[PDB]
């Protein structure tokens, strides 16, 4: 399905579609505020990816159950 489209989608979310921005060009208090904000956002992303790994484990367990049911079903 034009894996070129999938590759470009991945790369845009990698560089363009993700909230990427040069910001360390500001005054003191504002720079600290922005650093805190970005660090907290990425921390929330840490929580999100921790749950991503958790649910991926769950899906692996579910596919284990899936294969088990398959083998028991034939």
């Amino acid at each position: 399905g034009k894996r070129q489209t999938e590759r470009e989608k991945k790369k845009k979310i990698l560089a363009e579609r993700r909230k990427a921005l040069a910001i360390d060009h500001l005054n003191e208090d504002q720079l600290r505020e922005k650093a805190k904000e970005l660090w907290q956002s990425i921390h929330n992303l840490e929580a999100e990816k921790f749950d991503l790994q958790e649910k991926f484990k769950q899906q692996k367990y579910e596919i284990n159950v899936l294969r088990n049911r398959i083998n028991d079903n034939q």
Binding site: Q58, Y61, N64, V65, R67, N68, R69, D72
Partner: protein, 160 residues
């Protein structure tokens, strides 16, 4: 056990009217309840319940243990109410899936009937003849050596 005693305590009046209609129909004057299992089954059918012919046979074969036909309305009505379904589907299949996710300590896509025994023992519960044997027999009912997820479902499906 205590479940039937509690159900007796929490007698639903909507079903109570049906049971007293059964009392009126079967009792023919100071009648001590000779247990006409055919009458009981026809009463169950009339009152809107749908007892199986297998349930009808069970009620035939699980009565008059006194041997005198006349039976205390206590145990009779316990049998009548429990034969009638009073529950909501016995939990949810998604709930059961998550519970099995908890219970797969073996982490092999299934649990074990031996694992079931170990967990129930860890719960510190009484194991007896009514326990122990048929518990694990019906947990791995297909007898695969371990309790698959669907086996865990079918062990206790539709039960509160």
């Amino acid at each position: 056990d205590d479940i039937y005693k509690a159900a007796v305590e929490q007698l639903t009046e909507e079903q109570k009217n049906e049971f007293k209609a059964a009392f009126d129909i079967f009792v023919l004057g100071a009648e001590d309840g000779c247990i006409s299992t055919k009458e009981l089954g026809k009463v169950m059918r009339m009152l809107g319940q749908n007892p199986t012919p297998e349930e009808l046979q069970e009620m035939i074969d699980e009565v008059d243990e006194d041997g005198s036909g006349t039976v205390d309305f206590d145990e009779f009505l316990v049998m009548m109410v429990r034969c009638m379904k009073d529950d909501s589907k016995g939990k949810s299949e998604e709930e059961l899936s998550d519970l099995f996710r908890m219970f797969d300590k073996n982490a092999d896509g299934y649990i074990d009937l031996d694992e079931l025994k170990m967990m129930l023992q860890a719960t510190g519960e009484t194991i007896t003849e009514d326990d122990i044997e048929e518990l694990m027999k019906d947990g791995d009912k297909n007898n695969d050596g371990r309790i698959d997820y669907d086996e865990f479902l079918e062990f206790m499906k539709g039960v509160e």
